[PDB]
Ligand binder design. Sequence first.
Ligand code: BR
Ligand code: BR
Ligand code: BR
Lengths: 321, 110
Amino acid sequence: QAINQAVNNLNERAKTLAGGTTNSPAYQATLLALRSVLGLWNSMGYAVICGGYTKSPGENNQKDFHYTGTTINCGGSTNSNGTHSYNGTNTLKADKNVSLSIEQYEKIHEAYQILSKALKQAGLAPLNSKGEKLEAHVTTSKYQTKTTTSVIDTTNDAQNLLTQAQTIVNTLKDYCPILIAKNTPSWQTAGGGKNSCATFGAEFSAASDMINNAQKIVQETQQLSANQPNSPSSLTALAQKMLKNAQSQAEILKLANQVESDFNKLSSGHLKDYIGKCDNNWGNGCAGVEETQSLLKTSAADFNNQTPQINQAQNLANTLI
Amino acid sequence: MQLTTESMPFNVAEGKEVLLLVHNLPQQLFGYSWYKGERVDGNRQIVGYAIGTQQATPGPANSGRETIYPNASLLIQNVTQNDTGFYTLQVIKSDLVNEEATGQFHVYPH
Ligand SMILES: [Br-]
Ligand SMILES: [Br-]
Ligand SMILES: [Br-]
């Protein structure tokens, strides 16, 4: 029964870890990766330059992206003193260290709108669940006047929302578009006119890694769920399960901790004073990262604190074999 | 000061060179584009330059006799009669506000 005692500990910890929310560091780690990317975009997204021609300057490609709230234009620019010009960023070829293309920005806008909608309305599903289904509205404008709205059936499960997150981080980090220059947040009076990966290089790195590690946490949770614990045969089968299951619990806490470390990297530079805040909401994260951060610390420390159970459960298994 | 342009020389012997100087460039810039005509127009862009990549990418009107400089000057060499007339510079500022200036020169023969 001292074995049955450790079995119960492993399960109940695994149930919290894989099926909980408030009290799972796997969950909050995952949520923090997701909410971080959202704040990243709320905090500096508006200053990303987009519109660069793909094929040729002769396309006057141009589109408005709606956040609802505000609208963002790609392609255009402002005429000195007033009016909107239909010639602007679309006048220069798009590439790394210059500009995003309409197509690239619309990938991001779609991901954003989905992340934003999932998190606000359904919430991140417990890692072990297939998730709820929900409908994001993505909305854009053109001239020639045409308004478009895509309604996307989608799910609030970690793997989905993380792909959304990934699409935004990768674009910024692989393409490093220039930021608009000039009230003004610190980084804009300092990085406008210069690529975004020279202002936010560290921050995009940290975000990239949070997505990875969160992804890896999800993997391990799937396969933690795979292994849930009187002859030699039952003593070996459900006992290998113990080793597999404890080894999973540990790795998950390792990654959950690494995410807490990248979050610090994320929020210790130009975004220190902006992500984490809120209140037209552009320019600060408005994403609940502070909430999620303390809860990840708290939960993680609870499990950390229960590391005897896992030490002293792993022995029992090794004893048997 | 508002964005001027100026041609050196204004009257150009066919076969030779002309330099479109640009006065009052703003110091902080996303990029700029030159065009043939009096207007900013995609299909008549001679060349665009992104400060970001210090990289000049030619548009459809480019004849391969143009060199653009980071002070926005445009040099046109081996000028023909058809190069005569108007040219337009669009400067895009770091804050995505633009400015235009139209330039002109005449090319005569021999
Ligand atoms: Br819970
Ligand atoms: Br549209
Ligand atoms: Br907030």
